[PDB]
Enzyme design. Structure first.
Site, PDB file in Angstrom:
ATOM      1  N   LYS A   1       1.584   1.810   3.862  1.00 14.35           N
ATOM      2  CA  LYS A   1       0.586   1.614   4.919  1.00 14.35           C
ATOM      3  C   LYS A   1       0.705   0.299   5.683  1.00 14.35           C
ATOM      4  O   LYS A   1       0.570   0.278   6.906  1.00 14.35           O
ATOM      5  CB  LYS A   1      -0.820   1.731   4.315  1.00 14.35           C
ATOM      6  CG  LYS A   1      -1.962   1.526   5.293  1.00 14.35           C
ATOM      7  CD  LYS A   1      -3.306   1.615   4.573  1.00 14.35           C
ATOM      8  CE  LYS A   1      -4.467   1.449   5.540  1.00 14.35           C
ATOM      9  NZ  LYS A   1      -4.342   0.183   6.311  1.00 14.35           N
TER      10      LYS A   1
ATOM     11  N   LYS B   1      -9.853  13.736  -3.064  1.00 17.01           N
ATOM     12  CA  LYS B   1     -10.425  13.018  -1.931  1.00 17.01           C
ATOM     13  C   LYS B   1     -10.645  13.897  -0.694  1.00 17.01           C
ATOM     14  O   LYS B   1     -10.043  14.964  -0.551  1.00 17.01           O
ATOM     15  CB  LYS B   1      -9.517  11.835  -1.565  1.00 17.01           C
ATOM     16  CG  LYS B   1     -10.144  10.849  -0.582  1.00 17.01           C
ATOM     17  CD  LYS B   1      -9.173   9.765  -0.150  1.00 17.01           C
ATOM     18  CE  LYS B   1      -8.076  10.335   0.732  1.00 17.01           C
ATOM     19  NZ  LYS B   1      -7.128   9.285   1.217  1.00 17.01           N
TER      20      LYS B   1
ATOM     21  N   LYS C   1      -7.573  -2.990   1.586  1.00 18.96           N
ATOM     22  CA  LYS C   1      -7.251  -1.620   1.980  1.00 18.96           C
ATOM     23  C   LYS C   1      -7.509  -1.387   3.474  1.00 18.96           C
ATOM     24  O   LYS C   1      -6.681  -0.780   4.166  1.00 18.96           O
ATOM     25  CB  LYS C   1      -8.077  -0.631   1.144  1.00 18.96           C
ATOM     26  CG  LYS C   1      -7.694   0.833   1.330  1.00 18.96           C
ATOM     27  CD  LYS C   1      -6.274   1.146   0.834  1.00 18.96           C
ATOM     28  CE  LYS C   1      -6.156   1.058  -0.690  1.00 18.96           C
ATOM     29  NZ  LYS C   1      -4.951   1.783  -1.205  1.00 18.96           N
TER      30      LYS C   1
ATOM     31  N   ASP D   1       0.748  -1.261   0.000  1.00 20.39           N
ATOM     32  CA  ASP D   1       0.000   0.000   0.000  1.00 20.39           C
ATOM     33  C   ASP D   1       0.777   1.309   0.000  1.00 20.39           C
ATOM     34  O   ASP D   1       1.766   1.461   0.697  1.00 20.39           O
ATOM     35  CB  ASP D   1      -1.017   0.038   1.145  1.00 20.39           C
ATOM     36  CG  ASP D   1      -2.262   0.820   0.775  1.00 20.39           C
ATOM     37  OD1 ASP D   1      -2.133   1.957   0.267  1.00 20.39           O
ATOM     38  OD2 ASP D   1      -3.371   0.290   0.984  1.00 20.39           O
TER      39      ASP D   1
END
Ligand SMILES: NC(=O)C1=CN([C@@H]2O[C@H](COP(=O)(O)OP(=O)(O)OC[C@H]3O[C@@H](n4cnc5c(N)ncnc54)[C@H](O)[C@@H]3O)[C@@H](O)[C@H]2O)C=CC1
Ligand SMILES: NC(=O)C1=CN([C@@H]2O[C@H](COP(=O)(O)OP(=O)(O)OC[C@H]3O[C@@H](n4cnc5c(N)ncnc54)[C@H](O)[C@@H]3O)[C@@H](O)[C@H]2O)C=CC1
Ligand SMILES: NC(=O)C1=CN([C@@H]2O[C@H](COP(=O)(O)OP(=O)(O)OC[C@H]3O[C@@H](n4cnc5c(N)ncnc54)[C@H](O)[C@@H]3O)[C@@H](O)[C@H]2O)C=CC1
Lengths: 512, 525, 512
Positions: free
Chosen positions: C468, C399, C360, C311
């Site tokens: 991540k 976003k 995710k 990620d």
């Protein structure tokens, strides 16, 4: 405080009010070429209002031991007995803030200087005060309302202690628990059920004897307190929608039959409703589940009983619908709207299961429908929207709501608005509950005749202001515009005392 | 009780004292006119001496003892020391010191037999005084006892105040020094516990040297009435207006002292408390934004060799801001605008409602980002611009009580014309944050007073003799908005770096190297 | 701009750097009575850094036609050719803002006044510039990168037009499309596939010939541009995790075997990784899916190839992890943390399917683990947390992230912090991608030996700062503390040029 209108439209006789009212409106037909043809319409009515209101109103809440139930009872006792309490801001006096019927005002007209004159919402026509509410009800958990208060963690500890002696005396009646209808995690909370078999176990068998026990609970409550009027309101965990299938719950005979046949499409709420209807007591559904199936509505009309409901209009949805409308009224096109809510109460605990939340996840299509200038196939008649509810136990009853609106402005511009709302959910729901009970009681004393008087049509639409998913009449679609839901109530009260609808023209100023 | 035993040959124990050798490494740099960096490593060995016998009781004297912070401080101490549980709508709560870095944070000591990080209490490494052993007192221009103070402050749970009622009622502030022009005009009616009174008992800014002598005796009296050896003084009173520094006035030790005698109009109450504590050899901590430590005063501290520190408590808003601005610049992002608004309804925001009081505040709540900009000339330079619009607003809204509402908008530039907009909204009882911070400052100051050291000459055993920390305890910057610096050195506001310094300091005393985060036990076969 | 340290720890020979470094750390054991016994440890190392860096670095992005891919290519061309562009704020000069390697600085030490002296991040040791990146790659859609830019709506229109002529020349190579691995809605986007059968249809059969075609694409790219060094990075739609079962993908032989056996546990990413490993080119996984299964890791060690990933550490998770740590370092106990993110790009479009988002939806347990003072069984060692990603197409690549932290303060108090973040996701991801490629290339030129040189252990942990879900070594748990992930990188660069780790003690000031 009272209001006296000098109008020939109103005459009193035997504590009875007769008011003449010519209702105007119009029928529109957009010809092929897009031309709007409008023919005004007018219907004359006469309304009869029984001025004699109950000296004490009986209230039976299903889910009496919850956040709303316990707070409702605490508010009534706190105000009724003027229980002032200690807070770190000092002593506070109880009140009904948040209640429209108790704490909002209305414009009666203008004084001699040309300035608006306001009067209490409940000062135009007689209305029952929440201070004269006698409260009882059911709950699958048997904790007294004092323990229920502690458990809810909604009220100031000191106020909880000052009401300890009185609240401990109140205890919920056993209720109907059909496990499959709510969130499974509400299984060990159920220690107060009437639906038990010979082996003392919880059963969904014998549904008719369950219905008969509820009617008995209502009769006993009435007799036991010497009350003539009682209203029942559902404020229990949201149930999973039931399937409306023909032959089962499409008519009052099938419905009543299915109940006897222990049919699986008969939920507990279905039984509390059918039981209230049969006792002739108004029934208000404060949850999103589709309790009022066809069959149930028939039984309500046949008995001429008032029903109403479909969710206790959260203060966020309420306000979120207002801003949305504000933007569209301004010619601004919201092209996206995101909502995110998270709470830590049992309510949010029960919504954890998608079956319970799916009922809740059920207004934007109406606003977007009102404006084809911004919403059409050439520009894009769509608005992305999402509703997320998460259970964050640490925030308790103090919910946090966040709404983000993204709209398009002229010439490529954009506007982003974020609304962050924080408050104890129950402190907003309680007063809403009070307003609903007060107005339902009010409407039961109103009859009309076009020009023998008929009951104010069972499905009380004026109550859409306090219900997220306004119940409706077959064919007519609901309108959620909050300002319009209050404008309806306001004008109705006004027409009952001979005053016209607000026009805001203020010609005494605008014209010479 | 948790403890830490480091098996090292760098540490030896002798008569309630720990002796630790430490080789301090750094590097001096120069940038060739052309554009290269010539880096010369440096080393300097030291032997640190830590007095292990900590005081059984530590005297604390607060200036502003009856305010929101002073009030809560005593309450927190009483509640925790006696384990005074209380009722709330979430039920019975046990007292604690949440918000206190010293009492509730941990430090990584190393890795375990399996490679997993191991942490221990910040205060478990070396002996530190517990706030439960604080013997608190102090001064205040208002005579309300501390229970009334609690009531007026509306910070603590009603039930808690009630359980603390009896004890807190007996705690009364000593009369203080009130010089009308140094604070907001509204505190006017609040001053009824002053020592500076004239013949007819009126407020008077005359006889400032007498005032200095009274404060000093107060410290002495407090100390003996409690059989205390140690005492630290901390200013947590209204924010005064900056005093102008002028040659021959307060530019030197001698000048300042005489000015005090001459009743100079640039000698503020804080100046006197500062001077009094320093002359008594009592550590003095300034928890407000006013420039109490003028040159002459710092000079007196240096001369007396007494610990001073401070300038504004690092509010949870300016703390979080330093953490976030640092983060953005460390990531190569360029903040071009930082709007910081906020409103409170306590006496703090009421006194700040005046432009001269807010001014001191606006100086410390801002500077906190000047060093961040200076560290990156890739982003901030003459071509792209090296400025960052930054405005600070503090509005008084009584209806919000001690609860402060902070809002910060960061607008930064991203690559190729893009932008980032971060909004930080903060709500909390401002005083429940400040109080543990005051506890941290006192615990660390006290710890520091027991630390001494000496340079070690590599080519000559045991040279020199032990000294004490340079008077200005910059080690306490983690808790202060406007870090007081030594002449010549710029302040560092990097919060994470400020805690790291504290961490590494404690680590070295027990013979542990600084944290490197390299983790080669996993990153290398 | 360059750095020259005078230290005997460093010696240069043949454009090769040899640095001595004594690494200290400690082993801890908490005795029964809760006493911490600590034994310091020390390991001496010698690092070899090949000072000769590639004059041009080959970059092959899987998902080259996406938001990140097109923006990566645009950034390289825009800066490389100094393409200044028009905006309503006037002409802007291209730059690599957001890139740590290109736009962050480091403290080398102090000057003569006792003040910190900072230097560019990439000025200590030689690093390749993104301006010397030669970019190619694969994508299931064949649109050229100009069309890809238009489609992404990430960059200023005018900048898009100034790069139109160059971007149109770049086109993605056909790729491997296994439908079942991503969001079904990515079915009509796939018009550029190599995995087709005789009937010209897309198949998951012949996976080995697919792997062989990727290796060929890499060889051709290298030869075609006369490049010695190439790095491959996955920045395509998130795949659904594959199941790690014994005999299938637990060893490099089974894995390679399964690939030949067209096993269903072999995803496209699995093949691009195995293909890069076999060509000896570093492979970076920028998505959450578990591409690096056991077998794949073995093949990476055996070939001595660098892999890394899991990620592209969103700028929100990055910052959200920093604040969280800040609070816990301050003795403040976050008892609740709510995250809500909504985007309108294809990325968010692919996360729509729970199978893609589930990857995710995968750090808080580490922080809570660091402090047992606040987190234990007596107080409550738990932190409610939630991660919601919604697809709101109208917000595009821009976003919106929102994080709400609710913490407990002392004596019953609470603290609520809300973080609202808005930005074009790709403008943050692109520079991250640049930093990853720059540091991976850097690490391939570094070898070490405890005291024959070994490669800088395949799983590049220093790269956790930009990922991540930090990949790890069997047994060791990852650490996400962002400041510590940058402190690692910083000290590593420092130790390579003879400088010690930062201690922040500033004894030149604190001591006499
Ligand atoms: N939480 C709030 O403040 C508000 C709640 N609402 C609505 O009102 C409803 C109730 O909310 P709260 O009082 O907060 O929740 P709650 O979970 O605290 O109270 C519900 C009560 O219902 C009882 N119960 C559940 N099934 C029952 C049954 N079959 N018969 C009798 N009692 C039963 C439960 O034992 C519980 O005490 C929700 O489902 C929601 O639709 C809407 C807005 C705000
Ligand atoms: N309250 C908070 O959350 C934080 C406070 N601070 C700073 O700490 C200081 C204290 O804050 P609070 O306790 O909230 O304010 P406060 O206004 O409630 O308390 C100050 C007390 O100081 C007394 N006082 C004023 N001048 C004095 C003098 N010359 N001698 C003795 N007493 C005197 C006042 O009578 C009052 O009781 C302020 O300067 C403020 O800017 C900084 C960060 C956070
Ligand atoms: N959107 C953003 O800016 C950021 C994205 N990420 C991560 O990076 C990934 C890519 O993000 P974006 O570029 O924005 O999304 P995107 O959806 O615009 O780009 C992905 C590209 O992958 C291509 N693709 C899909 N499967 C493929 C296959 N098997 N072989 C070759 N090409 C294939 C698609 O056709 C598309 O053009 C995401 O899955 C996510 O894990 C993380 C942070 C920010």
């Amino acid at each position: 405080t009272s209001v006296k209108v000098v109008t020939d439209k109103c005459t009193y006789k035997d504590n009875e009010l007769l008011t003449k009212y010519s209702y105007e409106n119009a029928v529109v037909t957009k010809t092929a070429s897009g031309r709007f043809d409008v023919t005004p319409t007018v219907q004359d009515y006469v309304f009869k209002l029984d001025l004699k209101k109950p000296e004490k109103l009986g209230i039976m809440l299903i889910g009496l031991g919850g956040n709303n139930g316990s707070t409702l009872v605490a508010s009534v006792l706190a105000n009724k007995h003027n229980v002032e309490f200690q807070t770190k801001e000092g002593v506070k006096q109880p009140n009904y803030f948040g209640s429209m019927t108790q704490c909002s005002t209305l414009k009666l007209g203008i004084d001699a200087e040309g300035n608006d004159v306001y009067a209490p919402f409940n000062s135009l026509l007689p209305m029952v005060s929440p201070n004269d509410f006698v409260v009882s009800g059911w709950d699958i958990n048997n904790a007294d309302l004092y323990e229920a208060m502690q458990r809810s963690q909604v009220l100031e500890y000191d106020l909880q202690q000052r009401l300890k002696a009185k609240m401990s005396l109140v205890k919920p009646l056993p209720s109907i628990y059909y496990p499959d209808f709510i969130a499974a995690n509400q299984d060990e909370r159920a220690n107060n059920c009437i639906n038990l078999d010979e082996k003392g176990n919880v059963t969904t068998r014998g549904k008719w004897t369950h219905l008969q026990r509820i009617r008995r609970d209502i009769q006993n409550f009435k007799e036991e307190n010497a009350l003539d009027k009682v209203i029942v309101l559902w404020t229990a965990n949201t149930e999973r929608y039931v399937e409306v299938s023909p032959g089962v719950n499409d008519t009052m005979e099938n419905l009543l039959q299915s109940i006897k046949n222990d049919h699986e499409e008969i939920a507990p709420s279905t039984i509390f409703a059918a039981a209230s209807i049969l006792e002739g007591v108004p029934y208000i559904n404060g949850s999103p589940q589709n309790t009022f199936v066809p069959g149930l509505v028939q039984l309500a009309e046949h008995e001429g009983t008032f029903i109403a409901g479909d969710d206790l209009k959260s203060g966020q949805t309420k306000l979120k619908s207002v801003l949305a409308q504000f933007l569209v009224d301004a010619g601004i096109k919201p092209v996206s709207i995101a909502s995110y809510n998270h709470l830590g109460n049992n309510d949010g605990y029960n919504l954890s299961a998608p079956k319970q939340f799916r009922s809740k996840e059920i207004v934007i299509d109406d606003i977007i429908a009102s404006n084809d200038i911004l919403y059409n196939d050439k520009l894009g008649k769509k608005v992305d929207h999402c509703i997320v509810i998460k259970y964050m136990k640490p925030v308790g009853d103090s919910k946090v709501a966040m709404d983000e609106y993204y709209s398009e402005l002229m010439l490529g511009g954009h506007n982003r608005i974020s609304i962050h709302n924080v408050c104890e959910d129950s402190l907003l729901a309680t007063p809403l509950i009070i307003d609903l009970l007060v107005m339902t009681e009010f409407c039961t004393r109103v009859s009309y005749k076009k020009v023998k008087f008929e009951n104010f049509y069972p499905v009380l639409t004026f109550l859409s202001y306090w219900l997220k998913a306004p119940l409706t009449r077959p064919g007519f679609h609901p309108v959620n515009g909050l300002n319009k839901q209050r404008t309806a109530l306001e004008n109705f009260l006004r027409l009952l005392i001979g005053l016209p609808s607000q026009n805001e023209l203020r010609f005494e100023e605008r014209l010479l």
